[PDB]
Each structure stands twice: as C-alpha cells, then as structure tokens.
Structure 1
Amino acid sequence: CETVTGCTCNEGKKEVDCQGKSLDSVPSGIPADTEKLDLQSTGLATLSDATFRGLTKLTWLNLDYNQLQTLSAGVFDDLTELGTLGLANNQLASLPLGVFDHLTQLDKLYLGGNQLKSLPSGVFDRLTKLKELRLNTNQLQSIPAGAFDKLTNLQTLSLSTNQLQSVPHGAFDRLGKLQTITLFGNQFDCSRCEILYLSQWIRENSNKVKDESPDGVTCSDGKVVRTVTNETLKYEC
C-alpha cells in the first residue's frame, strides 16, 4: 500500500494519508476497505469518474487545499458511506448537477474558499442528514429558491464573504435545528423588498447569527439589516 500509493497506510485505522505529499493524480492501490482518505495539500488539479471507484467503505475524504476547478459529475458516485467531504480552498468554478446525490449519509460538507458564483437548484436535496454546510468565501451571486429546504438536520450554515444581494423569500424556514449562520461580507441591497424576509428573520433568530454578531450583517448602504422594516422602505413592499 505504502509503496503503491506513495502515502502512509494505516490498516488498523483503514486510513490512507497522503496529506502534504505531491500527487499528479490520486494514487492507485487504495485498499477497497479504506474509511479515511486524506488528500489535502497534494496539488491535485483534476478528478475523474474513475478516481474513487469501488470505495464503498469510505467515510472521510479530504480534498482541501488542492487546485480543483471542475468536478466530473460522477466523481463521488461510489462513496455512498461518506460522512465528511472536504473540498475547501480549491478553485471550484461550478458544481455539476447531481454531484452530491449519492452522499446521502453526509454530515459535513466544506465548500468554502472556492470560485462558486451559483449553485444548481437541488444540489443539496439528497443530503437530509447534513449538519454542517460551509459556503463562505466564494463569489455567490444568489442562492436558488429552496436550496436548503431538505436540510432539516442542519446546525451550521456559512454564507459569509460572498456576492449576495439578497436571500430568497423563506430561504431558512425549514432549518428547525439551525444553531449558527454566518452572513457578513455580503453586499445586501436594503432598497429592494426582498430584504424584508432577511431583516425579519435576523430579528427572530439573532442568537444564531455569528461572526454572536447580528449587527454585523449590514446593507451595502450602512444600515444594519435587522433594522430594516417595510416602514424603512416607505411601505412600498
């Protein structure tokens, strides 16, 4: 294993740890019974539908700090037991439709630090047990209506440092177990009626808004978002 992969293999932990080792591609020879695969900081730039073939026991995959721009659409399809997927700090420009659909047992999904401008509509729909979703430090221009509706288990949602001007009406209403949300570093437009959903939400959920920092969520114009009411907008909504 250790000679075939170039990485450290620990059979007792069902772990293949390549962290910090230069790779031109994910190595061959990963045992089919592997549970934990550490590919962080390996310099990976592409993955294929073949890369993780047969890793039906894998629970933890860390692809953080690589140079991925594009994911093949079937890249994670065999990884049905996956619980943690680290994809933070790559150069992801988009996510293909259905990319996470097989990961139904996923608990944490790290997507922060990429180049995402958009998300496909039902991209998170199958992740019904997800507890953490990190989307901070991308370039998100909007969130699809319903994006989070199936995430009834969600405890943490990070949306800070994006390009968001609004959130869709009712974006967070299904998130009954939510504990932490981040929303700073956006450019919310407090002149548009769309803001009223978010201002009322922040007022009713201030304890959940974190840097706790509800007043840190501010309009592109300087107003603190939770201060904005239809009266602010001259009753025009």
Structure 2
Amino acid sequence: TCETVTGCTCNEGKKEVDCQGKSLDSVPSGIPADTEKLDLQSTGLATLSDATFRGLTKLTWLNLDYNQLQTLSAGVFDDLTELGTLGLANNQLASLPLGVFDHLTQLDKLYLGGNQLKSLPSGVFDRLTKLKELRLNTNQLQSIPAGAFDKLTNLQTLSLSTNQLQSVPHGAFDRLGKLQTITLFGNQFDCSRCETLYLSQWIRENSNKVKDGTGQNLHESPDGVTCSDGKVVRTVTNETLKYEC
C-alpha cells in the first residue's frame, strides 16, 4: 500500500512502485524520487511526453507493457540514465522517434514485441552498447536499416520473427559476436534477391543460433526459416542464384 502514490502498491525497501492493472488517467505525481522499479503495465496509458518520468533518475526497471501507446516523444526517457530494463511490448506503437533511447547507455533488455513498427530510425540502437536482449518480433517491419545492430556488441538475443522482412542488409549481423539466439521465422524473405545470399550463408554458418523462441535450452531450427516460395532459406547458395546473381 503506497503512502505517496494513491491506489498503487509499494515496497519502500526494494524501492518498488506497482500500479499494474490500475486504470491510470496519467502517471501519478507522488512517485518517490528514489524509486528503482516502476510497473505501469496494463494501466491504460495512452500517451507519454518529455516530462512524464522527469526526476525519476534512479529507475532501473520500467514496465509499460500492455498499454495504448501509439507514439513516443524524443525525450520521454531523458532522465532515466540508469535504466536496465524497458518494457514497451504490446502497445500500438507505429514508429519510434530519432534518439528515443540515446540516454539509456546501461540498458540491458529492451522489449518492443507486439507493436506496429514499420521501420526503425537511423541509429536508434547505437547508444545501447551493453544491450543483451532486443525483442522486435511481431511488428510490421519492412526492412532493417544498414548497420542498425553494429553497436550492439554485447547482444545475446535478437527477436525478429513475424515481421514484413524480404531481406536483411549485407553483413547486418557482422558485429554481433556475442549472439546466442535469433528468431527469423514468419517474415517473407524474397529468395530471388541477391541479398539472400548473405542471409543463407549466415544461417549455414550460425545454424545453432536460429531458434523458434528466445528461451534457454531450445534446440536450433535452422530449417524453420523459409523463403516466400516455400524453399528453406539455408539451402539457397550462390549456385542456386547463379542466373539472378
């Protein structure tokens, strides 16, 4: 029972504020300025702005899953320099602002699954050099920008399943030396395109990474990623595309 945040529950010891499942008309004003964990999942939040989290500089965990957010402001996360986990899954996000995550240099997990993203801004992840987990699955992504993932040298899990990808740019995964798990199924890879060749060779070379989920102890599914014409992607070689390429 929160003394200072009406109708939310608290653990002042653990610096936790839990408002999950409370109908919110705005983010409450009485949140302790030393709060570390803030749960706002399923509160019905419809907008955020540059000032919404202002002053919550100790936050390390913020959960905005299952709200009604359609856009974010460029500065909404500005103050939150110690954030380690950001939950933005299962909102209605149609786009991300340029620089939206740039202050989150300690971010460890970023959940953007289950939105309506069609594209990613130029360099949106570049500041996130400690990111271990990125979920972009179940969106509407039409492409990935060249070098989108290049700064993500600590990344272990990248989820890209259920999107609208027809290819990935050449060397898209080059810098991901710590990758363990990637999801690629449910896209529409156009295996007539020369860009396929980078992707098929990658999957042959990294076949133990290609999985049907993000959890531990799941056996690889390198043949579960299929071209829009039904062919398994990893079977497509330079020789397969000798005519086209």
TM superposition score normalised by structure 2:
0.95
Q: Which runs of 5+ in 1 are unaligned?
A: none
> Is the aligned partner of 1:234 residue 2:239?
no
Secondary structure in 2 matching 1:164: coil
Contact 2:108 2:132 in 1 (8 A): yes
1:170-215 deviation per Cα after TM superposition (whole angstroms, max 9, x unaligned): 0001000000000000000000101000000000000000001111
Contact 2:102 2:126 in 1 (8 A): yes
Contact 1:230 1:236 in 2 (8 A): no
Cα distance in 2, alignment partners of residues 105 and 174 from structure 1: 19
1:20-78 deviation per Cα after TM superposition (whole angstroms, max 9, x unaligned): 11111111101100000000011101011111001110000000000000101100000
Secondary structure in 2 matching 1:226: helix
Q: CA deviation at 1:231?
A: 1.1
Contact 2:4 2:31 in 1 (8 A): no
Cα distance in 2, alignment partners of residues 33 and 6 from structure 1: 19
Count residues with an aligned counterpart. 237
Cα distance in 2, alignment partners of residues 214 and 125 from structure 1: 28
Runs of 4 or more consecutive aligned structure 1 residues displaced over 4 Å after TM superposition? none
Cα distance in 2, alignment partners of residues 114 and 137 from structure 1: 7
Cα distance in 1, alignment partners of residues 21 and 184 from structure 2: 32
Secondary structure in 2 matching 1:127: coil
Distance 1:101 1:5, change over 3 A: farther
Q: CA deviation at 1:235?
A: 4.6
Cα distance in 2, alignment partners of residues 5 and 32 from structure 1: 15
Cα distance in 2, alignment partners of residues 155 and 25 from structure 1: 35
Cα distance in 1, alignment partners of residues 77 and 6 from structure 2: 20
1:93-128 deviation per Cα after TM superposition (whole angstroms, max 9, x unaligned): 000000000000000000000000000010000000
Aligned to 2:119: 118
Q: CA deviation at 1:234?
A: 2.4
Cα distance in 2, alignment partners of residues 99 and 113 from structure 1: 18
1:133-176 deviation per Cα after TM superposition (whole angstroms, max 9, x unaligned): 00000000000000000000000000000000000000001000
Aligned to 1:130: 131
Q: CA deviation at 1:2?
A: 3.7
Cα distance in 2, alignment partners of residues 89 and 208 from structure 1: 25
Cα distance in 1, alignment partners of residues 3 and 202 from structure 2: 52
Cα distance in 2, alignment partners of residues 5 and 123 from structure 1: 35
**% identity of equivalent residues:** 100
Q: CA deviation at 1:233?
A: 1.2
Cα distance in 1, alignment partners of residues 211 and 71 from structure 2: 31
Q: CA deviation at 1:3?
A: 5.3
TM superposition score normalised by structure 1:
0.98
Q: CA deviation at 1:5?
A: 3.5
Secondary structure in 1 matching 2:116: coil
Cα distance in 1, alignment partners of residues 152 and 27 from structure 2: 31
Aligned to 1:107: 108
Contact 1:5 1:30 in 2 (8 A): no
Distance 1:122 1:100, change over 3 A: same
Across the aligned residues of Structure 1 and Structure 2, the Cα RMSD in angstroms comes to 0.9
Aligned to 1:16: 17
Cα distance in 2, alignment partners of residues 193 and 51 from structure 1: 46
